[PDB]
Amino acid sequence: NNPLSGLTHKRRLSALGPGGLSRERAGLEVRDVHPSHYGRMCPIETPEGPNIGLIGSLSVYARVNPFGFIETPYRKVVDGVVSDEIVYLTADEEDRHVVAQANSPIDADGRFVEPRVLVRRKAGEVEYVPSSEVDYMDVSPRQMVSVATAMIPFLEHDDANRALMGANMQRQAVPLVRSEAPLVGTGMELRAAIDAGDVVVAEESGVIEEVSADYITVMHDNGTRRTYRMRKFARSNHGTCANQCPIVDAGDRVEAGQVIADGPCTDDGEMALGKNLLVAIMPWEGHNYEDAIILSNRLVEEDVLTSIHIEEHEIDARDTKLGAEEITRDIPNISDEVLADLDERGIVRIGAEVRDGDILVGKVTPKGETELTPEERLLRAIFEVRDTSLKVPHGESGKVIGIRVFSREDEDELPAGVNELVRVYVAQKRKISDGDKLAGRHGNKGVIGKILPVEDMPFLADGTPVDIILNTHGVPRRMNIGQILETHLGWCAHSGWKVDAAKGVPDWAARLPDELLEAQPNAIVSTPVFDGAQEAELQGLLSCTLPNRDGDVLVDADGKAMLFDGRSGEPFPYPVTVGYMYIMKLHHLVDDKIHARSTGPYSMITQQPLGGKAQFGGQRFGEMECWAMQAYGAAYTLQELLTIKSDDTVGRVKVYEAIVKGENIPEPGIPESFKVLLKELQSLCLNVEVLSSDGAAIE
């Protein structure tokens, strides 16, 4: 889906499989966190479905030894002195010593400030211990978390549930047309993007000799040349668009290991899984009611949340019993208007926009005479190939960008019995729509319930309308205070700040690095996990936020601002928390998840409608839903569901006929599946018989 998803996948630890255990053979004890996972397996990133606890992500600094165990680094403490000597310990090796937490106060020389320090001890025992007892200590605060989990700002303020959802949904982010790095970051974005491998890094230092949208040629210092080719509009495994764009320009000095071109969800080498959106935290006329999201049509007009998706369509021409299927533009009983977009071969031409049902590859298959309906044979007499053309499935629509043809006649090695094979690539530019799923990094998820015009949105004092409205009620229950903090800092990053340096450094910013006392608008900041911005420093920064171009400070020290209702004009009675939040577009879009069926294919054995959207199947009226009908007493609706609407071979056809005739619905018959049941009970030497009121067995 996006580079982070692939990286995490390659760093997975799965408990299932041969030699391990079966899913039915995994109690509540194999799945919960174990005290030895510290610094080795993340306790957060794990699915919440039936595979919870069985699939983990390797910790950041963890490695694997030749034996197979997972080692993690620790700083050796000599005599109450922190040393830069780093040694990797296994689980049992770690238990034989005692380690101090990463965020212990340390002297500039290495001596611990406090005599007592937090220490982890054998058997997963946490307690304070004297400074003269610490043998090792943790390397970094984020030592215990995964790559994705380390990508959550203010992670220390989010509960493990919403944090799990945030880390798991970051892997569901959709690559946008254009990518924007987040204002509020963590530091992990860079290395995540680079080590993911979906960018283009220079192997050896040099200068850019010639750069194009197609490739980038680097002239090294020694004299050699290396050319990196950009992957453009490539279909990902999940339909997302993997598109690389050069960053450097012609004649640019580039060092070794520098990002010269970044791909999907990347900006100057950092993971850009979403966009920075101006957020207001307020209820709005019920359109954002519990977890629904309201968005500004700006995001539609300016393609802020637009994404590219590519589908692969495939068809083959085989040898049949009565001849061979041929791919031809000449299709029986097809107008010249539908075939207007096809080339001479029956293939759609590049650039043509195709709706659902349109022909992409015209293939006809010869059908024998002994397979014709009596009405079909008469219609053939009263007026030998049938239509098997490749049509666009329901719900698909885009520009045809690529075609690939393989012909047995032309040396192309196809499976025995195939003469030709055509693959058509269709690309769709999906704008954000009502019902698409967005989410933040703190398990704060929601669908789009309404996209209002830019003028309807509550706008700030200077006229800038907000971009996204989140309901307030679904905030304090989930215990994801992160977003709140993230919101505040977000604004401080957009506007910048200037701390009063005169009369000394204020008492709150004494611990802030000198690089933070001044920040320009659209500044990039990092809030490392379990370190980073503390609530006090954030309070101060809100106190010293930069003014706008007119010289006015829009948000208060509390972080709230006065908004105007764009529909009525009256300002909202109370100040509202306003900021910038990083929102991602998740891969759960109505364009894919919408489905409906009148009729369609039926399973041959059970004669019940197929399942799944891809097979044009129907929804399953399960057992519980039958209980619902019975509870309502809707007897006729239940019979209808289980007979004429399902597997009544004659009943469903008579229903179709009665609908197109305007007549009434006929009487349901017997389900074919029950006939199958009787035959199956007979196959087990059980004589099942249906008796009438008189007693005679009926056939």
């Binding site: 580039v254 060092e255 990002v259 950092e270 900041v525 990092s526 503390q534």
Partner: peptide, 23 residues
């Protein structure tokens, strides 16, 4: 500064603890 090794954008960190070993 944050991640000063490849030539990346200068992302400023609220970091209080130094990183002895890079990822």
């Amino acid at each position: 500064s944050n991640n000063s090794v490849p030539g990346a954008p200068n992302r400023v960190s609220f970091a209080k603890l130094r990183e002895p070993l890079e990822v």
